[PDB]
Amino acid sequence: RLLWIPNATPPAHLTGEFPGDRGFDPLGLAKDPKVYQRMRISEVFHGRLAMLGIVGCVAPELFFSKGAWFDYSDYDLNRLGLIALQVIAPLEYWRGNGGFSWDGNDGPDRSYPGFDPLGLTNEETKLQEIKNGRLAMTAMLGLEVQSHITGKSPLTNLSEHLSHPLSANLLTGG
Amino acid sequence: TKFPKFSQGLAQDPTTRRIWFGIATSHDFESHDGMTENNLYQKIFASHFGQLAIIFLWTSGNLFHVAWQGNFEQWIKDPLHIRPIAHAISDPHFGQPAIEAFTRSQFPGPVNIAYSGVYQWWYTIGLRTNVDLYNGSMFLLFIATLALFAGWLHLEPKYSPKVSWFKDAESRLNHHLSALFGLSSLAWSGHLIHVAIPESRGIHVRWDNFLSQLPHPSGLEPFFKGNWSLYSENPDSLTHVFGTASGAGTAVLTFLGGFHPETKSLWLTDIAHHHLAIAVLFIVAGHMYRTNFAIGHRIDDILNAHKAPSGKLGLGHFGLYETINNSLHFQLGLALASLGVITSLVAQHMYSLSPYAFLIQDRTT
Amino acid sequence: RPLWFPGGYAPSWLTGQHFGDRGFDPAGLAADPKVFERMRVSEVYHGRLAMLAIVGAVVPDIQGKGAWYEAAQSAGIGVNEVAVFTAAYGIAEVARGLKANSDPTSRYPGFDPLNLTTDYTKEAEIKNGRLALTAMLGLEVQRHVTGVSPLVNLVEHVKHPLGHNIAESVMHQWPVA
Amino acid sequence: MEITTNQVYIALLASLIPAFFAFKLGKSLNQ
Amino acid sequence: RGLWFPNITPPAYLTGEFPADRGFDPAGLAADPKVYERMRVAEVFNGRLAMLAIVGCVYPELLGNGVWFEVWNSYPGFDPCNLTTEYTKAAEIKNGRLAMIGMFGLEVQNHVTAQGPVANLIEHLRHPLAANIGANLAHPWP
Amino acid sequence: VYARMRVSEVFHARLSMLAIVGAIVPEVLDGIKLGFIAMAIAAPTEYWRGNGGFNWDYTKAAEIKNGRLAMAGLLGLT
Ligand code: CLA
Ligand SMILES: CC1=C(C#C/C(C)=C/C=C/C(C)=C\C=C/C=C(C)/C=C/C=C(C)/C=C/[C@@]23O[C@]2(C)C[C@@H](O)CC3(C)C)C(C)(C)C[C@H](O)C1
Q: List the disulfide bonds (chain B).
């Protein structure tokens, strides 16, 4: 039984069975088997988006000589939003639904729908997904807060911390 | 004691022989205790990945130390009069006179002059800045990583190939001749035409502009119509300065022979034509053996056919295919013989037909 | 019983159970059993903190940012900045000091991601601690008697061992820094 | 131009990745 | 049998008996086998006609005679050597469906870009991050 | 099939209703500024509409008939 802090009490709702459980729920939001099930879905899905997000922020600027991710003065958000929502609507629905039928439950698992050509699904890979997801979520929170405190690009933040570690902290702003 | 675990006989020895003979038999996998053919081929395949990674890390380190501690950009300004640097010296044992003796260039400290000729080779193929080198270094570190991961992965039981996969000669020969030799040669022709030859004529082409920058003024229309000669039209002059547009040409594929007068090296457009012509040969070669599509030769049939009617060779090459396919030492012997010959070839040819800019003037390299 | 001094005499209260018992208490400071456990806590604490200190007194002097006694004022850090640190450190300190001196977690809070807790590692902690504690004592005293940086002290002694040692140093008026 | 101290740091931390993979492959080849 | 989606339960009427069946009908057309027969005629025909159109839309532009949208100004038996196996039958089905999605492609690209499909390919290959669907639609499209 | 066909025909009906009625009234009296907020408001509701909640007989033909007219009326109106 792995634990989020040393010398801790794993709460009774968290059993040690589902991938990623390290006995962390101080607010107690996962007592019921069904609400735990839904929050599990939401965790993995927040994870997967965050991972795409953190790549989608860093890689353009680092590899394709772009600007910071929070410079939206290139496009009208309403147009992209309308296009994006039209495209995303059936996908997020079919996910929630379970399938293409009206009472969709036509086979897939709703979190692990079986999109693996290479055949690599096991408990270990599941835990790896959760751990990379949690790290990426943390990172994406950091990107947002850093954006609002420093007003500078994330790579620029990393460069200034590396150059001057004693003065470019959270304790001095940067 | 325990070491070596692959030999119980050695691991019972109560002497210091155990240690020495343990190190000296560690890579001789056939002689290991309870070795099967499957396990033998799988450890060979992984070790091969390990060798590849070591080679890519070595290259990555040459690139890194030259980008960080060398004088590649200064050397590029004055190739015939600046000495290239390998790395810095950080030996606490040195005295102040030795520090003053080994301090050559503008670097703040003692350096080693490089004699490997990597400066001439990098400058010829288009690199021009320490950032170029550094990015190459990082790429190669990534390819190393891939090799090491592949090594581990193909050692897992689900991806461990079977002996039949290892003994598939015709397929390997097709893939290795068509792709490894052929398509890698065509790619190199692509690098030379799209990056190196421009850089030799002053135009700076990198990943951020190569998709737009036309490597020839006429595009691919000449290629597809059949007017191939248009790619040889206006070669560089005998007054051309490497790296500038002064006296430069437009041709991308020639057959001039001899050397570029300033660099005293072969012309790059002849090197591009070379790599393209042999690519076409290797790709055609790689479509000769029978795999899974009913066309092609079976190697045993070729072997079994060649027998002199006089009987002066006996039964000729009968039975050789299973002999060679089942023997790794035969295969290693044939490879090393071939490589031996080719290495001497590279030595005999690179001094006489020098292919790199400003390398013949560097006498020690 | 390995002891601190040859002859084979240990105090009665020091039996040889705890880690680092070498029969060393000639001032009887651990005779009472309740004081012993507190002291066993503070030895490891002092030890760990000194270990950090000694590594932190050498590394910025190697890097060429001045010696440890001239490293505060060289980068600012006044008495207000030690006050803010001391307020910040207080939270962890009272969290530590809420538990008893009899609980094994009071020394060993369990943060072991590599899983390297054995008995060999506990004695090794206590031994490296006591070595660093004497090293800090050494730093302070050397600072005052010689009046130069510790790395200077070490370098002079390695190059000229008769030249620069304690005997030479203590034959001048020594409170100099 | 001159490779900066930052680019040395990134190079080091990157190099830690094939160190780990080396260890993995070594352990696997060693029975 | 391969399916068009992973883990979906296939319809009962679509079971692998025809060339290149991948159990795809999630609206419900081919339930009655007679309808499935006429659709199989329609799919083979529209596919062969789409593949003809694909060559007839690209090859004129490749030659350099003009662009296809500016220019407006069942198994029968015809065959020498019978290669008609289930492989080749299914291959004809596949290439037909691909070319249909192709022709869907050209009939959207002509309206979005207003340029030739070759030029579309060349301009992607010359500016990928600026001449894709996500940059043609993002700004108001002619 | 009819399971959903019914509910589509119902929804298409009520859709056509609002459109045909609220096409006349601005006539007898942009599309990206408001289209985005329309889809953004439609997405939380049409999900719950489809799901059944917040979880992971005259007028059973009257409105279908009047709906089918409003569907066909819009087909004229285009
Ligand atoms: C692979 C061959 C290679 C070789 C022979 C060297 C050699 C050297 N390096 Mg360099 N180094 C390398 C790759 C290499 N490097 C790479 C790829 C990087 C970028 C990550 C560096 C980053 C680096 C720094 C920052 C420094 C050196 C330094 C040095 C010098 C002293 C040794 C040292 O301190 O390195 C320590 C080693 C590292 C910092 C990481 C090395 C990573 C490689 C891949 C090691 C593995 C080699 C090989 C695969 C092992 C197989 C051998 C085995 C079969 C017996 C020495 C000349 C020092 C120097 O410049 O002194 C003047 C120094 O400060 N190197
Ligand atoms: C578990 C638990 C608890 C908890 C918790 C915690 C810490 C939860 C918090 C989650 C956290 C911290 C994070 C979420 C995800 C971030 C996402 C999805 C980012 C998307 C990223 C995307 C998709 C961004 C996209 C773009 O950037 C791209 C790619 C390019 C840019 O140009 C433009 C935009 C912006 C569009 C309690 C409450 C503490 C106690 C309880 O008892 C138990």
A: none
